[PDB]
């Protein structure tokens, strides 16, 4: 289909003793496939999907080297940023980094990104042109001048347009049985009386993949948002996702209300009614 | 595959 590869990195300083906590995870679409945790025993990049286990020792050696290199860069950054912001050595602080690439249905490059945050706020990010930088404040502006002088965007662009896309295609082929399979939502409706004259109708979407989905309620054929509740999409724990939407209705009028489900795995949207 | 060239801020 249309696809993405993304890596996520978090480093948290520990001022009382020792090095920061460092956690890295890699995804293809909504499927985690590698991880590194500085608290874990292996001290290696580890597989988390079957289709990555076939990569050879050179793969795992190189990804371990690179992810440890990311970890030490973040360790340095935490010290540098404490200085840029004139902060004490007493408190814990956080660096986060996300980067990756999107490809279309034809597996051609669509866009790339690289975003960096300090203490949960934008710090510096690569613009969509893959040449320029967005600096949120004057500390990040110092970083921007440094990365300009060192040609960083050039080699990041080369990675995002090349290596990133090329290995994404490789993973998509090796894991095609799941990564290129859509799991349409399994849907049903429940009914929960709230009094002797009104009731909650809850529309369920279960066991679907990928995570993107839209659930909407209609009354007599027109969208309704009054008296509705929509929960955040949530992981089932087996690689699929769940969501529900509910509406409160006068008892006996349930047939006016329809739940509409849109998902990449559905050729046409589904309609559900209570009966 | 990871990027091989992150630079410090």
């Amino acid at each position: 289909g249309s696809h993405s590869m993304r890596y996520f990195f978090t480093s948290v300083s520990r001022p009382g003793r020792g090095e920061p906590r460092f956690i890295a995870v890699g995804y293809v679409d909504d499927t985690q496939f590698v991880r590194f945790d500085s608290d874990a025993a292996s001290q290696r990049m580890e597989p988390r999907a079957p289709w990555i286990e076939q990569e050879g020792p050179e793969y795992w050696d190189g990804e371990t080297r690179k992810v440890k290199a990311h970890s030490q860069t973040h360790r340095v950054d935490l010290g540098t940023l404490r200085g840029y912001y004139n902060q004490s050595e007493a408190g814990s602080h956080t660096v986060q980094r996300m980067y990756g690439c999107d490809v279309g249905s034809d597996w051609r490059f669509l866009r790339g990104y690289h975003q960096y945050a300090y203490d949960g706020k934008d710090y510096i990010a690569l613009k969509e042109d893959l040449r320029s930088w967005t600096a949120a404040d004057m500390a990040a502006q110092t970083t921007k001048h440094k990365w300009e002088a060192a040609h960083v965007a050039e080699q990041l662009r080369a990675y995002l347009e090349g290596t990133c896309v090329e290995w994404l295609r490789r993973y998509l082929e090796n894991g095609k049985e799941t990564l290129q399979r859509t799991d349409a939502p399994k849907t049903h409706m429940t009914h929960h009386a709230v009094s002797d004259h009104e009731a909650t109708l809850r529309c369920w979407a279960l066991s679907f993949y990928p995570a993107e989905i839209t659930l909407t309620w209609q009354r007599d054929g027109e969208d309704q948002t009054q008296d509705t509740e929509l929960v955040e999409t949530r992981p089932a724990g087996d690689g699929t996702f769940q969501k529900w939407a509910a509406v409160v209705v006068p008892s006996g009028q349930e047939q006016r209300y329809t739940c509409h489900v849109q998902h990449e795995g559905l050729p046409k949207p589904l309609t559900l009614r209570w009966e | 595959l990871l990027w091989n060239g992150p630079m410090a801020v």
């Binding site: 978090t10 985690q32 814990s92 956080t94 945050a117 203490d119 934008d122 929960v231 724990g237 | -």
Partner: protein, 98 residues
């Protein structure tokens, strides 16, 4: 500082006496340090596992905590969360309808 959202739910539609998986999904929080326990009749369940820390577009974190469980008529399940934004631990009861 952003306080966690909490959903407690089963992996599969629940039937009393049938094995299942109990999930606590915490999201929307910052910083990432967080304590999450799954409770059975008020007591902490042991050997609970969790996903690897990741985050959303707005930089807030999310984690899934999970364990095997068997719903019953008499047993009560819940999630207990502590975070710097919480003056006291927040307890959310599992309700099989949500």
């Amino acid at each position: 500082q952003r306080t966690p959202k909490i959903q407690v739910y089963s992996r599969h539609p629940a039937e009393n006496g049938k094995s299942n998986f109990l999930n606590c999904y915490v999201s929307g929080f910052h910083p990432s340090d967080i304590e999450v326990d799954l409770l059975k009749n008020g007591e902490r369940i042991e050997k609970v596992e969790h996903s690897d820390l990741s985050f959303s577009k707005d930089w807030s974190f999310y984690l899934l905590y999970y364990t095997e469980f068997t719903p019953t008529e008499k047993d009560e399940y819940a999630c207990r969360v502590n975070h710097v934004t919480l003056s006291q631990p927040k307890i959310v009861k599992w309700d099989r309808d949500m």
